[PDB]
Amino acid sequence: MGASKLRAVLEKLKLSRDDISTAAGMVKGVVDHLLLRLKCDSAFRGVGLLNTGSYYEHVKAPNEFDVMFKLEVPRIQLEEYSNTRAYYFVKFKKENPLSQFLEGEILSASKMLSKFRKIIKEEINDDVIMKRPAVTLLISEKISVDITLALESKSSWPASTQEGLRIQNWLSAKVRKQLRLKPFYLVPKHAKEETWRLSFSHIEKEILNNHGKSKTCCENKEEKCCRKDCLKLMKYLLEQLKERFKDKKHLDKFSSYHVKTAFFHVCTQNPQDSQWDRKDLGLCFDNCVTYFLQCLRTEKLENYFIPEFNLFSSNLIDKRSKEFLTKQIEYERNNEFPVFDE
Ligand SMILES: O=c1ccn([C@H](O)[C@H](O)[C@H]2CCOP(=O)(O)O[C@H]3[C@@H](O)[C@H](n4ccc(=O)[nH]c4=O)O[C@@H]3COP(=O)(O)O2)c(=O)[nH]1
Numbered sequence: 001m002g003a004s005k006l007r008a009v010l011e012k013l014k015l016s017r018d019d020i021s022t023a024a025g026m027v028k029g030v031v032d033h034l035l036l037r038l039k040c041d042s043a044f045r046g047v048g049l050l051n052t053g054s055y056y057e058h059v060k061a062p063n064e065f066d067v068m069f070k071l072e073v074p075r076i077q078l079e080e081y082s083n084t085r086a087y088y089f090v091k092f093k094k095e096n097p098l099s100q101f102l103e104g105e106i107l108s109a110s111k112m113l114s115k116f117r118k119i120i121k122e123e124i125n126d127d128v129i130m131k132r133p134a135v136t137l138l139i140s141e142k143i144s145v146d147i148t149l150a151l152e153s154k155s156s157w158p159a160s161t162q163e164g165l166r167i168q169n170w171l172s173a174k175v176r177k178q179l180r181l182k183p184f185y186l187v188p189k190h191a192k193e194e195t196w197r198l199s200f201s202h203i204e205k206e207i208l209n210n211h212g213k214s215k216t217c218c219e220n221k222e223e224k225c226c227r228k229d230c231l232k233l234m235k236y237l238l239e240q241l242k243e244r245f246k247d248k249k250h251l252d253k254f255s256s257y258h259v260k261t262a263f264f265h266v267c268t269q270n271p272q273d274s275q276w277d278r279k280d281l282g283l284c285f286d287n288c289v290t291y292f293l294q295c296l297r298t299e300k301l302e303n304y305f306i307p308e309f310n311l312f313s314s315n316l317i318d319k320r321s322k323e324f325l326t327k328q329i330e331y332e333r334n335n336e337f338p339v340f341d342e
């Protein structure tokens with residue numbers, strides 16, 4: 001695939017620019033209102049908007065939004081669950097604003113989520129309609145907004161992330177150090193329970209928006225790379241393939257985060273900006289796909305922050321599904337990607 005062809009596909013996808021402001025206005029208004037009203041509670045006093053992009057996490061999809069509400073929870077004691085390395089029980093090390101959500105010694109996620117959804121449903125009452133881990137809203141019978149509650153911890157990152165975030169040869173060890181000083185998050189998610197999974201969406205956004213070895217990367221004509229284009233192309237490939245086979249539960253468990261993680265690993269493999277030259281968009285992309293296929297074939301896709309947490313384990317995704325996706329992707333690459341046609 002020629003780089004200009006790929007960029008033609010991407011530019012063809014960018015045709016939603018005029019609508020972006022119109023949607024962002026309404027969504028921004030509703031979300032801000034929900035924040036204003038939601039701040040009134042004692043438990044959700046320090047609630048806030050994490051704002052990690054505020055754009056779409058799905059390309060092809062201008063109607064679906066994803067927002068995340070952070071809550072400062074000072075002095076927390078995490079307890080690892082069954083060596084899952086990613087899922088934890090939240091404890092407290094007396095006066096606790098979240099004491100009402102305590103089911104014994106462990107902070108209950110279901111009750112807190114219930115109070116959350118209850119307040120939000122109390123505020124939508126006064127053309128927004130709530131739908132039956134996340135809380136989905138429907139603005140103007142068109143726009144979908146996924147709201148996620150996340151606990152914020154300004155403590156040092158858990159031990160399972162010690163050997164994660166290998167960006168030393170890419171973005172330098174200095175940046176890794178300053179990044180690991182930032183807080184980490186916890187989203188309500190069960191393991192394959194009342195457990196919480198680690199989340200570093202802010203870090204992902206940060207490394208994506210500051211992706212070059214050079215500080216001036218993508219700031220001048222001579223230093224424009226094709227990292228973001230590769231990520232977008234991968235995401236679009238997976239999205240189109242999932243769209244073609246929506247009638248099957250094979251590709252249901254495959255999503256953009258797998259693609260993003262694989263992309264991050266590829267970035268680690270190719271730390272130099274010269275390895276992501278603009279004119280080489282065709283090759284770089286071809287690399288990414290290949291690596292992704294490897295992750296499908298070897299059934300190994302380590303979380304970029306939690307190396308011992310495998311996203312492509314047999315327990316999470318069965319071999320058959322990965323083989324099917326492999327077949328489809330390989331066909332696509334072998335036939336100049338006909339799935340990008342429209
Ligand atoms: O921060 C992250 C995000 C994703 N992952 C892994 O993929 C996780 O295994 C993901 C891999 C797919 O994730 P997703 O973003 O594509 O899609 C999510 C997400 O859309 C929704 N969800 C989950 C939590 C939440 O608080 N609010 C939500 O709406 O259920 C989907 C499936 O999530 P899983 O646990 O079923 O498996 C991580 O490890 N850390």
Ligand SMILES: [Zn+2]
Pocket residue numbers: 211212217218223224225226227
């Ligand atoms: Zn760049």
